[PDB]
Design a protein around this ligand. Structure first.
Ligand SMILES: Nc1ncnc2c1ncn2[C@@H]1O[C@H](COP(=O)(O)OP(=O)(O)OP(=O)(O)O)[C@@H](O)[C@H]1O
Ligand SMILES: Nc1ncnc2c1ncn2[C@@H]1O[C@H](COP(=O)(O)OP(=O)(O)O)[C@@H](O)[C@H]1O
Ligand SMILES: Nc1ncnc2c1ncn2[C@@H]1O[C@H](COP(=O)(O)OP(=O)(O)O)[C@@H](O)[C@H]1O
Ligand SMILES: [Mg+2]
Ligand SMILES: [Mg+2]
Ligand SMILES: [Mg+2]
Lengths: 512, 460, 52, 173, 460, 85, 52, 86
């Protein structure tokens, strides 16, 4: 701590660098203060979206350039402002710290550290509001991003550069599903970004604690706008997350971003619109809310190697960057015909519908396979999974068509009883415990087991212990094959023979 | 001193005009002499031109235009500390029992920031409650938030009085009860029960009940929090009971239009979620000290998807959801086990056996819901022979979730019971495993442990 | 644990620089308060009008 | 507030006063018409719900200093639209329009102390390089800007104050 | 020179003031420099006194007040003719494919009157698509319109990609594709599919991407339609593809709400049926040539009744409904043989052979639906001999309606097939007449033509 | 605070002389155009439900007769109407 | 380590009292754009010790 | 519901019962008195006991015990007394 010498020298470097000459600026005066909105009279040269600078290190986003006023929303505690204060119009747009140093930091939406573990070591700044890569810049998504859920990676693939909506009622596992997606990417080279809109701070601390108890936190950035922070910060926070993820995308790396509750960004934006007196639409949401999410989600993209080389000025070659988004939405009473669910259901590439009935009945994760979709689909899987999951799709489709008879089952004919029991066994197979992700080898093995009829005789209540025993058996006894599959995902008659051998040996030699 | 004039009066909100240079800040408190009286206004907005727009912390009637208002230069501030303890106080922190001045050393402004994310703490330490369903399905931790979501007249006050009885008498630290916009009768009964138990000198009481005008019901919860926040910062641990949080947002809605704000989803104010968050975010534990809270949350017209409950759910750790369709069967407490939930219901935390029992109970009750339509149409005889057993076990589990309460002897005579957790997971594991499967349904209704049920069967 | 110690070092070697910076600018302001001179003030005017 | 509703009457009055080269007369006619609005009693009558032209007539009766055609017609049109309380701002917008049309501007000078005159000469001449207009200084003194000077013209300002340096430096630190 | 000044900027809405001699008409385009970048505005209303209310055709950020606006005395107007083919353009007719300037011969304004009732000509020339289910069940003629109805993920876009490939490779007809609210991922997939399939040099592409302001997403349909009108005036038969009507109506709802019109039934703009008519009525087969169209229409939540799909039905001639259930059973292309319909499906126009083959397939499937729920309860063996034969033929028909597409060739790998209408009728009639009762069911799946069924049956 | 179709040129005309009896009661000028509806200033003798004859041989139907202006709907293509006709 | 750094923290508090005067004069001289051999150093040292 | 939330109980009069000649049609099970027996004369409190839950039980028991019945003597006396009471 005799570093005080350094301290004082650092302050001396800040003193030396102050270019004490003046610059002309444009000025205005506050004439109103209410609920976080201020009305500024003057600022003839204000621009829309500009950061206006108030007394104290505070700013406001000028959103209404009315004929004779400027409506601006304060980015922070506004109760201190007062009529008649003077205000300056910088030329600046909202820019945020960005770069590799952020990984493992928790920051608010201005990028101020909030974990308290000191300042940032960022790599410069980036504009919060940017335009996504054009049509010509994209490249079709053909790589997997593994969630580690049997239920998702088989029937609802997610590809690098896709945008998959997690949607469901309250308390059905939307956050658990996304955080397991993050945890699974600890080793996978994908850098994750978790951005929490309007959650209570103790929940944020809880999830960060779970990410630190697993290995994942060192990989990932957390961006926080707690429910006590003003609406401007809540509403902006998803853009600050995307601007952090694009630093990685535009440099050939892969990133994953998880906007928690876009259905609360929409609410903060509604509040801001109604206080600015903008004409309300349906359910009082302002009309542009589609544009609001549309521009945000369109930034999730995969960019071909030539756009990277053009951006990084030749420094990175032959690599394609990618940003994957998993927004979360909450629907009241399963109702998917509301304004915000229907907008984001229209924008995204797929949906994971989480059902509260399935969640109660024990099926966890509660993904509803019959109405969940993914428009990147088969293109994004490993070809072993691509091969094996087609039969799960059909098994469940026939089960869903037959299910109506389950309440008269005893009257049915065995020619259909076979199907109506295979459906139940494969469904009991897709249940999974939390924080327990599976490598692709294990999901492929466990799906092969059910696809080739091995489970046709195991009793329903034991399927889970069967699965656990199988995964342990293969992990000790046949590890090189798992290594091969996990490393390449390939499929061959050779691999199929090895798998048939493993199942035969297990089903005789071991027990569950 | 003066230097104001009134210029409008709409319902509860009053506009006041000051010289351009002296205009008060937001949330400052003004004062007016409403005849032979004194009235306190809290400023909410600064309009242009030296005007300011305020809410009246009192009866608005009797105000003329052109009165003179005095500008106190500080927000509302309330007594705080040991002095507050065992006394009843207004929203303005005046004493409202008949006893003397509050001898407090210190006064705090009721508007405060939440603690930093840096400061928060997390604890898994479970809190045992005598109530079978609550700590089977929705256990909660010391330092967490609990919320009782219910309709009108289903039991969210009686349940809170049993939680007070069970936790608060068996806990050493101080406690705070904030009555927000509910009956004065109940507050008086509570005060006399506390004083005739001699536990009153642990408990501080704040009361802005139904009778008061909207300003009181609006700002009283912030006072109750300010007192709990003091006791927390002293490094104690504290129990904070809020009598009905919904009345705070409702009092906000009543005033919203008069402040000139466009209405929103179902008439509510536009700032609903912020107004709720800025209160809810300061009622938390921290590394210096911890608050345990129980908040009753009324749901209007029994609609669990109304904006006010829907935005409340995200704040709370353990949510207990009462329902009228269960209470109309006489099954008190009327907790719905297929909607109750807790952040603490993890194998890591409650251990495998408890978690597995809870999930088994949920699975049975859900399977019973899936049958009620076919049972309703075709009658119970068309069920498979194993479904008749599912139904026969669910209809027992429902009763065994019932319990008689010590505070409810008034209504039913039967003496209350305290059931320990160890003693209830055993009973439910038993019923599920079908080893009490030779006992009539009414053997389980309103009993303590499973052994009082096996006894009650003998006597019919 | 070692990462938590290095965090506490950075945190207390930021708040200390805040304390010095505040006292530095309060001292420079007092020096300016007495050092103020009409000739130097007229040179401030000359520099701002030349920069304008 | 009435800024946005004074603009049309201000522009029309100015256009008219230009076409008749009587700007200087209109300005004081409007000043008088404004100060009649501030009278204790008239302001009450202006708020009362009387019919337009009866209010217009009661207003004209109080003015003999209005040119008997054009000022009356302005007042009567404003009465037809119930906007008589906007006169205080129609006046200001008329003045501003006059400034803009005559290419003449005012600039404020706020200083630690009175300047040396030739300083004021350099300030004005360079502001006439900054702005094209003929610039009229009106200096003021404030000890808060303990040294240097602030130039405030319209809503563009140049902060040469030592106080501005002191705090602009303080927020680096 | 530039003669107007901006006075307001509220989101995407911008207001401009002009001297009263120079006021732009409605739909006139204005231009302003948003710093180092040009922005154009389209006039939506004239209000007040030389004030004009406008929508920005580009990102609104960065606009100051007082910027200089130069008015073009044109509406928006775009390049047309052969020069466009194989280019991708935005709504303004600027390239976004980086292949440089378009090389326009002529520019046409995007707003123009529909053909008079006098100019139309009713001609019933059926289209041949090469898609077995569509050509058999839902035929449509030149000048007509087809609506592909279905939920998300069912295959509207890939069906349209296949339809483009078939029309362009087999019949050489110019096509315009207007992506109203296009997903950029799907637009890049389309561009690379058309360039790999080597059809691209006979298609012109227009994209209004989702991330663009509402003014862009609304008007793109008129740009694509104006390009189709130029090719029609050259006497060609062109085919116009619109990637959603639903997003067209959403962009119209957004623009209406931004302009502050009072909303209607479910927030939809007052003008919904007019905007739909103004778009749909220019797509007709005047005597000089023809525009045919196929249009995708998402049905939100499977209701088929909210105003955007309900209002579009009045204009469509054939409707093809895709179901996710069928798709999940793997019979792509996932038209549902019973629900799809066409006005052109009557003997007088399709011929009795075709009409009877279609009704036969419908009868066979409709009886198989009856039989499935006997087969479930009683098993196969209780059916009569002709009931088992009907089931076997119905399954073989249900399988035979599947087909491999040259554009799905990337998803499956299997090479696509084109099936002529002769072969479709001869195949379905031969199956229903039992000429192929000796082949197994799997032999029919995904083969393409009926001779390929006969061949495939050998190797299985 | 909303202006009510009173604007710089019209107010200068009323400045010139207030009671503009000079104007015929049969004619007027378009002062707004939007969404197919136009507002006409003047036409003191328009009668509700009347036919108003626009330039280009088209018609509008006077539906709203208000304190200062007539709101009418256009019976055909409206886009080429302009303020001041 | 937390008690060890608290010892280090007060030793830095000792060392910084000198440097903050040097920072105050460097700030004042950069602010005014001129050197100043100020006379009434009593005001400097009075601040220098009193708050620290 | 707003008013059910303000009072100290409710007497819910049901129209089905009222049409069946059961007058007054006090529906027990919904109706309650939040002050309970504290208000009653000692004799009435003694004699009434928890009677209203007895009639609530009888009335829901009649929900299943019309088309069939079980334990058909103790339920039979339960039903007999409930019927003579009502
Ligand atoms: N696969 C699983 N198996 C068992 N329990 C699970 C699983 N996934 C989630 N849960 C449990 O479900 C509960 C709710 O989880 P979670 O909070 O992730 O849902 P949510 O949708 O985020 O709720 P909210 O919308 O309130 O945030 C958690 O307590 C978690 O333990
Ligand atoms: N354990 C219980 N035993 C018997 N009755 C109960 C029990 N719990 C609640 N009740 C009934 O619930 C009714 C509603 O009272 P209360 O809980 O005050 O409703 P609210 O939740 O609206 O305050 C009371 O009249 C009481 O009789
Ligand atoms: N004939 C087909 N062959 C292969 N895949 C198909 C076919 N039809 C649809 N799909 C699949 O459906 C998914 C979405 O296709 P898309 O055309 O985008 O559907 P939509 O436009 O209806 O949303 C993709 O996985 C695509 O592979
Ligand atoms: Mg969550
Ligand atoms: Mg209650
Ligand atoms: Mg689609």
């Amino acid at each position: 701590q005799l570093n005080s010498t350094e301290i004082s020298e650092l302050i001396k470097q800040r003193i030396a660098q102050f270019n004490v000459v003046s610059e002309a600026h444009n000025e205005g005066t506050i004439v109103s203060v209410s609920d976080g909105v201020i009305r500024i009279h003057g600022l003839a040269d204000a621009m829309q979206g500009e950061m206006i600078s108030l007394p104290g290190n505070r700013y406001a986003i000028a959103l209404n350039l009315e004929r004779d006023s400027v409506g601006a929303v304060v980015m922070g505690p506004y109760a201190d402002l007062a009529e008649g204060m003077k205000v300056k119009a910088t030329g600046r747009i909202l820019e945020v710290p960005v770069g590799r140093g952020l990984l493992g930091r928790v920051v608010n939406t201005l990028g101020a550290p909030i974990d308290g573990k000191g300042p940032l070591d960022h790599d410069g700044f980036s504009a919060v509001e940017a335009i996504a890569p054009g049509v010509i810049e994209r490249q079709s998504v053909d790589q997997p991003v593994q969630t580690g859920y049997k239920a998702v990676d088989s029937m609802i693939p997610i590809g690098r550069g896709q945008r998959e909506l997690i949607i469901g009622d309250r308390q059905t596992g939307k956050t658990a599903l996304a955080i397991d997606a993050i945890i699974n990417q600890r080793d996978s080279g994908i850098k994750a970004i978790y951005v929490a809109i309007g959650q209570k701070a103790s929940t944020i601390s809880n999830v960060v604690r779970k990410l630190e108890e697993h290995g994942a936190l060192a990989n990932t950035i957390v961006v926080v706008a707690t429910a006590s922070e003003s609406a401007a910060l809540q509403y902006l926070a998803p853009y600050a997350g995307a601007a952090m993820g694009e630093y990685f995308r535009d440099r050939g790396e892969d990133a994953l971003i998880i906007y928690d509750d876009l259905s609360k960004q929409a609410v903060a934006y509604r509040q801001i619109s109604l206080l600015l007196r903008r004409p309300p639409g349906r359910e009082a949401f302002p009309g542009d809310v589609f544009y609001l999410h549309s521009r945000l989600l369109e930034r999730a993209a995969r960019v071909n190697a030539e756009y990277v080389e053009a951006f990084t000025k030749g420094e990175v070659k032959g690599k394609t960057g990618s940003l994957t988004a998993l927004p979360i939405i909450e629907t009241q009473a399963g109702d998917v015909s509301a304004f915000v669910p229907t907008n984001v259901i229209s924008i995204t590439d797929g949906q994971i519908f989480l059902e509260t009935n399935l969640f109660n009945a024990g099926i966890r994760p509660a993904v509803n396979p019959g109405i969940s979709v993914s428009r990147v689909g088969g293109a994004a899987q490993t070809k072993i999974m691509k091969k094996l999951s087609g039969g799960i799709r059909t098994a469940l489709a026939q089960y869903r068509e037959l299910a109506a008879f389950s309440q008269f089952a005893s009257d049915l004919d065995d020619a259909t009883r076979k199907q109506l029991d295979h459906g139940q066994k494969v469904t009991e197979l897709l249940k999974q415990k939390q924080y327990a992700p599976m490598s692709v080898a294990q999901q492929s093995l466990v799906l092969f087991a059910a696809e080739r009829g091995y489970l046709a005789d195991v009793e329903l209540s034991k399927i889970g212990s069967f699965e656990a025993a199988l995964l342990a058996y293969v992990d000790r006894d046949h590890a090189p094959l798992m290594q091969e599959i996990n490393q390449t995902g390939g499929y061959n008659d050779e691999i199929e023979g090895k798998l048939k051998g493993i199942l035969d040996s297990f089903k005789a030699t071991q027990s569950w | 001193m003066a230097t104001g004039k009134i210029v409008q009066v709409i319902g509860a909100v009053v506009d006041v005009e000051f010289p351009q240079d002296a205009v008060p800040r937001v949330y400052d408190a003004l004062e007016v002499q409403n005849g032979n009286e004194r009235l306190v206004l809290e400023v909410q907005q600064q309009l242009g031109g030296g005007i300011v727009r305020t809410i009246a912390m009192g009866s608005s009637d009797g105000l003329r235009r052109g009165l003179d208002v005095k500008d106190l230069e500080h927000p509302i501030e309330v007594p705080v500390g040991k002095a507050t303890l065992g006394r009843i106080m207004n929203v303005l922190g005046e004493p409202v029992d008949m006893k003397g001045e509050i001898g407090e050393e210190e006064r705090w402004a009721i508007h405060r920031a939440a603690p930093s994310y840096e400061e928060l703490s997390n604890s898994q330490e479970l809190l045992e409650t005598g109530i079978k369903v609550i700590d089977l399905m929705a256990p909660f931790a010391k330092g967490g938030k609990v919320g009782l979501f219910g309709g009108a007249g289903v039991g969210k006050t009686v349940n809170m009085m049993e939680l007070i009885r069970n936790i608060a008498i068996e806990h050493s630290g101080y406690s705070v009860f904030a009555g927000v916009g509910e009956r004065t009768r109940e507050g008086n009964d509570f005060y006399h029960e506390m004083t005739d138990s001699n536990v009153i000198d642990k408990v501080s009481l704040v009361y802005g009940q139904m009778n008061e005008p909207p300003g009181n019901r609006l700002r009283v919860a912030l006072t109750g929090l300010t007192m709990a926040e003091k006791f927390r910062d002293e490094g104690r641990d504290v129990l904070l009971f809020v009598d009905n949080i919904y009345r705070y947002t409702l009092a906000g809605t009543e005033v919203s239009a008069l402040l000139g704000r466009m209405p929103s989803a179902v008439g509510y104010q536009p700032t609903l979620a912020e107004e709720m968050g800025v209160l809810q975010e300061r009622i938390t534990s921290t590394k210096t000290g911890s608050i345990t809270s129980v908040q009753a949350v009324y749901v209007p017209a029994d609609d669990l998807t109304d904006p006010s409950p829907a935005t409340t759910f995200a704040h709370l750790d353990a949510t207990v959801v009462l329902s009228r369709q269960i209470a109309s069967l006489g099954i008190y407490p009327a907790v719905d086990p297929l909607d109750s939930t807790s952040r603490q219901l993890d194998p890591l935390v409650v251990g495998q056996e408890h978690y597995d029992t809870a999930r088994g109970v949920q699975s049975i009750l859900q399977r019973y819901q899936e049958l009620k339509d076919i049972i309703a149409i075709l009658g119970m005889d068309e069920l498979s022979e194993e479904d008749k057993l599912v139904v026969a076990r669910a209809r027992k589990i429902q009763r065994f979730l019932s319990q008689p309460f010590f505070v409810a002897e008034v209504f039913t005579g039967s003496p209350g019971k305290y059931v320990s957790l160890k003693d209830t997971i055993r009973g439910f594991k038993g019923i599920m495993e079908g080893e009490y499967d030779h006992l009539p349904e009414q053997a389980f209704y309103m009993v303590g442990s499973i052994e009082e049920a096996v006894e009650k069967a003998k006597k019919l | 644990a070692q990462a938590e110690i290095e965090a506490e070092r950075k945190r207390a070697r930021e708040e200390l620089r805040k304390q010095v910076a505040i006292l530095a600018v309060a001292g420079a302001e007092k020096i300016i308060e007495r050092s103020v001179d009409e000739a130097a003030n007229s040179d401030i005017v000359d520099k701002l009008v030349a920069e304008l | 507030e009435f800024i946005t509703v004074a603009r049309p009457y201000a522009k029309a009055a100015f256009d008219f006063a230009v076409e008749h080269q009587s700007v200087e007369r209109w300005q004081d006619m409007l000043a008088f018409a404004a100060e009649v609005t501030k009278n204790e009693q008239m302001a009450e009558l202006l708020s009362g719900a009387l019919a337009p032209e009866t209010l217009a007539e009661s207003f004209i009766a109080v003015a003999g200093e209005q040119l008997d055609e054009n000022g009356q017609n302005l007042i009567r049109v404003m009465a037809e639209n119930g906007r008589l309380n906007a006169l205080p701002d129609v006046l200001e917008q008329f003045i501003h329009l006059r400034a803009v049309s005559e290419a003449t501007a005012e600039v404020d000078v706020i200083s630690a102390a009175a300047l040396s005159e030739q300083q004021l000469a350099k300030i004005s001449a360079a502001m006439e390089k900054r702005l094209s207009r003929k610039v009229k200084l009106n200096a003021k003194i404030d000890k808060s800007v303990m040294a240097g000077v602030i130039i405030r013209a319209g809503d563009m300002v140049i902060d040469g104050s030592v106080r501005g340096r002191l705090e602009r430096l303080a927020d680096v630190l």
